[PDB]
Every structure is written in C-alpha cells, then in structure tokens.
C-alpha cells in the first residue's frame, strides 16, 4: 500500500533504528521504569532494583488497545438531535 499511503503524514513520523538483538517485552513495577539493574541478581529483600516483574518468554503476536470516551445523551423532546454532554475520557484497555 506504499502507492496510496499519505506521504505527508509518513514523513513526519520519527525514524526508528533497528536494534541489535531480538527484543522481548516484559512487565516492570511502575516507578521502576527508569532504574537500571542496580545488582546482577534480584534481591527481593530490597526494592527499586530495576528488575522485571514478569519476563515474556515469547512476544505477543498482536496487541489490542481499546479506548471508550464517556459522552452522555440528553433526549429533549421535539428536537431533531439529542444533546451530547461530555462526561469523561475513560481508561485504555
């Protein structure tokens, strides 16, 4: 689809360099997202050691992101359209 793709938007996206090895995703405790492995081997007695909570053996084949935005409907009689009132944004699943 490289003949129909909008070149205007593609050229504005950042270019990413291919890394060295096959990367595996993981789950890490939050506020540990910026630490780097203070020790060679996990010491659970201490905290903020920068070790993943769970290491994926195999990367996911696909990842789905869902975001509903909470708007509210007000049905006023004898109106061609309902009133939509913004309620909130919602969490990404």
């Amino acid at each position: 689809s490289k003949f129909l793709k909008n070149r205007a938007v593609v050229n504005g996206l950042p270019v990413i360099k291919n890394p060295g090895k096959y990367q595996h995703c993981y789950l890490i405790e939050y506020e540990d997202s910026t630490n780097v492995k203070q020790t060679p081997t996990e010491n659970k007695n201490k905290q903020q050691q920068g070790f993943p909570v769970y290491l994926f053996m195999m990367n996911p084949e696909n990842i789905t992101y869902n975001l509903p935005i909470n708007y509210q409907e007000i049905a006023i009689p004898f109106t061609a359209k309902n009133q939509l009132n913004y309620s909130n944004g919602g969490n990404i699943v």
């Binding site: 509210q72 007000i74 009133q83 009132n85």
Partner: peptide
C-alpha cells in the same frame, strides 16, 4: 449534564369635646 427541577404554582387571583375631667387649678404666671 445540568438538570433543573422547578416547583411552581398559581396563586388565587383577586362630638365637640369630652364629657368629664378632673378639676384643674390654673395659675397665671
């Protein structure tokens, strides 16, 4: 949404002088 509740209603529509006095004393001054 802001909701309003209004409770309203309709009001219904539409002698010369006294007799006797105690005796006085008058003193010119």
């Amino acid at each position: 949404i802001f909701t309003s509740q209004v409770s309203a209603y309709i009001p219904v529509a539409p002698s010369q002088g006294v007799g006797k006095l105690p005796v006085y004393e008058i003193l010119s001054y």
